[model samples]
Target: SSVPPTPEERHMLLNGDWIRYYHFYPMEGGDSVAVTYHIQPGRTGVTFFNHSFSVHSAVLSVLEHIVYVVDRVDINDVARILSLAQALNEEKKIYDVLQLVETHDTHMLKQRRSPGIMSVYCPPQTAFQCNGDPFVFVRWYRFHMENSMSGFMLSNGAVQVFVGGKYELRWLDDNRKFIVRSNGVCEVLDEEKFPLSEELNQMLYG
Candidate 1:
């Protein structure tokens, strides 16, 4: 009798998800023999990103606030979640963004609340999740609509005045502001102060 082939690590891909295991059998086993099964390995359980991973394997706690320091946090989502974090003022839930990214819902009323960083994106105007601080949310203002009267505080402590379609990045003593308008482009302010009406209209209606 021929000795059976020892099980070897084999990775199988299914719908972009993976099924990893070891199989010891003849290549001619033809999906018939049990062959002493051997195995292992891992959520969309958030609808945002196309990919999802479990947090159980990668735990997060207050002491793990440095998690953001890693590349796991997306800058855009980081900005939104940081806003919400400031609102709750709970450093323990700092890893909540990871939870949100994995699961679309947060179990707040439950015993263990999964941080309250929740905001649904709306068409025409995407409403970002925010933690209340000292800024007033303005709607339909002169230069923009549904933006903060104050400025957006970047992770690096710099502030940017983000409005409808165009906003400025200015400093205390600087007379010039970096005008961010048009399609993914920016320029320094000169003499004219104009609103990106068409750009805003396209973003809103289109």
Candidate 2:
């Protein structure tokens, strides 16, 4: 799907002011999330390709640089890495959509907080429930747009540029039975790998 790029719409977004919009929706755990972003009309001067950093992923990108703050690295190396990460994120690449997320072992590249993996694993034929619990764990999800500008949303309520591989879901449970769910159905994950068992009591209490 594509947004309508009509002459009138362009005029509205190009009125020489910052445009604000809220991005709130239900994702994992059935929780509601709301994020805000802005658009600067003074960047492109009336072209459909116009959009500059008054607000949006640009701010998040800069935050990453600060959080990471590589002290041992040279100034030039720091600048280059920051630029590359920013560009990839701004363009919305799929990998950028899943950049520095932590699985069981992986940690987010820039913001090395805690283990925050967004997607939870459910066993096949089993229901995974997270009604109104506060998501303490941190997982991530990639926002892959058609424009190729991909970014990631973390369980810690932060978003970043994605850059990674396609880590598929394939693992054998304790029953020695391989559980898979390609049809968007629920399947229990190998507890040894994605051990959400500890969170069961806490989540159900919500």
Candidate 3:
């Protein structure tokens, strides 16, 4: 039952290179969405990024004045992922690994699970379907060694960050201690329990 934005109410977003217009409804049979309007300095056509979520919960973040949309990890778009990486590369923002965590999450099969011991009530063979690797650190470590760019790891099914600036999108390490320094000299932070590698293996494999 909400009304559209009046021209005057829409004024706050007109001057920026990006305008995020959103709408929501709590009444029965209504819709909710978060949509972005991207404008280049002199471009004629504006680009859009859309998500089917409440405006308050849209997962995007901006870095150094550039937009980095944080999508769910389980998307099935390799070409789209590579294309965005190329775009970031062209902009010389290859350090913006936050832009690609969506596909990385899907590729690595990261997922959400309960905090402690839980039961999989399925038969033996089918039980594997109920489990997942669900860790981003191990995957991101490989991402760093293989590619000369940034990457992501999830914390408790939520993407969190640390110390850069108002526009930084750095993902934290497995210990939830230090930020994973992108493209810097690589060293495994710790071997056994630093990332809870064994614990995660038990969750998915044991």
lDDT of each: 0.26, 0.26, 0.24
Steric clash pairs (candidate 3): none
Winner on lDDT between 1 and 3 is: 1
lDDT per residue (tens digit) for residues 30-119 in model 2: 543322222221110000111332212222222223111111111222212234455455444312322321121133324564233222
Candidate 3 residues 37-103, lDDT tens each? 1112211111112334211111212321232232333343111222334446653332232333323
- Best candidate per TM-score, number? 1
TM-scores of the candidates are: 0.26, 0.17, 0.17
What is the per-residue lDDT of model 1 for residues 1-206, given as tens digits with 9 covering 90 to 100? 22221222111111111111111122243441211110111111111111252111121122222122222333332122232354236433324443443232224325465322211111122222212212111111122344522233222233344353233432222343344333323445442443553443343343
The superposed Cα distance between candidate 1 and the true structure at residue 13, in angstroms, equals 41
Candidate 3 lDDT trough over 10 residues, lowest sum: 134-143
Give residue 28's lDDT in candidate 1 (0 to 100): 46
Ranking by lDDT: 1, 2, 3
Clashing pairs in 1: 46-102, 83-131, 84-131
Clashes of each: 3, 28, 0
